[PDB]
Amino acid sequence: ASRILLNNGAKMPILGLGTWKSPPGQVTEAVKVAIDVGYRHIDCAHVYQNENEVGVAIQEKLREQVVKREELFIVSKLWCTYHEKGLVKGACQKTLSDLKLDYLDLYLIHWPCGFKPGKEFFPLDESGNVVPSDTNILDTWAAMEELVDEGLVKAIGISNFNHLQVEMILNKPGLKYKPAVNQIECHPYLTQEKLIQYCQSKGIVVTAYSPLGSPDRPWAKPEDPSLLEDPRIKAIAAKHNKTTAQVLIRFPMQRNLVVIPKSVTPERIAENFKVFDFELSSQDMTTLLSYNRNWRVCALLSCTSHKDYPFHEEF
Numbered sequence: 001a002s003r004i005l006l007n008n009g010a011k012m013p014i015l016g017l018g019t020w021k022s023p024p025g026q027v028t029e030a031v032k033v034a035i036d037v038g039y040r041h042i043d044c045a046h047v048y049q050n051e052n053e054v055g056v057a058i059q060e061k062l063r064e065q066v067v068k069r070e071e072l073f074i075v076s077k078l079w080c081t082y083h084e085k086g087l088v089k090g091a092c093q094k095t096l097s098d099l100k101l102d103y104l105d106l107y108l109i110h111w112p113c114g115f116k117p118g119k120e121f122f123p124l125d126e127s128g129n130v131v132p133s134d135t136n137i138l139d140t141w142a143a144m145e146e147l148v149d150e151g152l153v154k155a156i157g158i159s160n161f162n163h164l165q166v167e168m169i170l171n172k173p174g175l176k177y178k179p180a181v182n183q184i185e186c187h188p189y190l191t192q193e194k195l196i197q198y199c200q201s202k203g204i205v206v207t208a209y210s211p212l213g214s215p216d217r218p219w220a221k222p223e224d225p226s227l228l229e230d231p232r233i234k235a236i237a238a239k240h241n242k243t244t245a246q247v248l249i250r251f252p253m254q255r256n257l258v259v260i261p262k263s264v265t266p267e268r269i270a271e272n273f274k275v276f277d278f279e280l281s282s283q284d285m286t287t288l289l290s291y292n293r294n295w296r297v298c299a300l301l302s303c304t305s306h307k308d309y310p311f312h313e314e315f
């Protein structure tokens with residue numbers, strides 16, 4: 001089953017292409033290849049600095065009539081320096097302009113934290129701490145709701161919100177649109193059982209980011225654990241005559257999650273899509289869940305004193 005129904009009534013493809021770290025000179029081909037081989041969901045963000053090049057690919061495939069716009073599911077995210085009532089619409093509009101779109105299928109609050117507006121994506125004080133904004137998640141959510149009502153986006157959601165932050169949104173006085181999605185890091189070393197059950201119980205669809213452990217994250221260290229090289233996962237893959245990456249992508253799918261592996265390698269883009277023709281057993285699923293070590297790979301010291309930094313909590 002290729003798509004999941006969201007609480008806005010739209011269907012979202014459970015497999016999408018990630019674009020963080022995709023070089024601007026390789027991402028246009030990556031997205032063209034992805035669409036040619038069946039991807040219909042692309043995960044984007046202004047902060048990734050490559051939306052223009054992603055958009056060139058999307059627009060060419062639309063112009064070529066490889067796909068119709070209604071068949072694509074394009075996601076982007078509001079960066080932390082735009083949490084301000086008077087900046088949200090322009091941030092969304094800049095993303096739309098870059099992507100060559102007249103609407104997004106889904107627009108996420110990228111991180112719960114607002115930062116001081118300006119040119120810099122991570123404004124710092126003289127001692128290296130991020131400079132916050134005083135605007136809270138509830139007022140930012142109201143600004144997101146306006147984008148739905150203006151026709152710029154078909155769905156809104158959140159990313160990297162912890163349990164209490166999701167609850168804060170759900171409990172917002174005068175809430176108009178519930179979040180459709182919470183996009184969070186999830187893989188066998190960070191299985192997220194608590195947060196996923198909370199969000200799914202509320203009808204919020206969870207998207208798993210970094211499903212391969214983000215081996216190209218810029219802060220990787222040689223000593224860090226490696227999902228793709230874990231011999232226990234390789235053994236499950238061998239049993240199914242699949243690659244380790246294919247197991248790592250199928251895993252979240254069978255948990256009723258959406259998953260967004262990144263690649264700029266054409267061969268891997270195609271491989272990663274070939275995950276609809278095999279089934280992990282319940283025992284395989286529980287075995288993969290057993291590898292949890294609460295390891296994130298996506299965390300940032302400079303932001304840990306922000307009042308809304310999400311990973312102080314437990315989930």
Ligand SMILES: NC(=O)c1ccc[n+]([C@@H]2O[C@H](COP(=O)([O-])OP(=O)(O)OC[C@H]3O[C@@H](n4cnc5c(N)ncnc54)[C@H](OP(=O)(O)O)[C@@H]3O)[C@@H](O)[C@H]2O)c1
Nearest residue numbers: 018019020209210211212213214216245261262263264265
């Ligand atoms: N919401 C947020 O805060 C947030 C944070 C992080 C990530 N994300 C989203 O999630 C996406 C995926 O996460 P990620 O980029 O961190 O990492 P990932 O998808 O876990 O891993 C990407 C890495 O895996 C490699 N790879 C891909 N397919 C492979 C295969 N079949 N075999 C071997 N290696 C393979 C890629 O190499 P090549 O590209 O060289 O092929 C790249 O180095 C991001 O791109 C972004 O769209 C969102």
Ligand SMILES: O=C(O)COc1cc(F)ccc1C(=S)NCc1ccc(Br)cc1F
Nearest residue numbers: 020045047048049111113298299300303309
């Ligand atoms: O964020 C991504 O999608 C992927 O990661 C990034 C992608 C970028 F293009 C630039 C920075 C990041 C970083 S450093 N993200 C971590 C991060 C940012 C903000 C806060 Br609050 C906490 C935190 F942990």
Ligand SMILES: [Br-]
Nearest residue numbers: 111112113309
């Ligand atoms: Br944050």
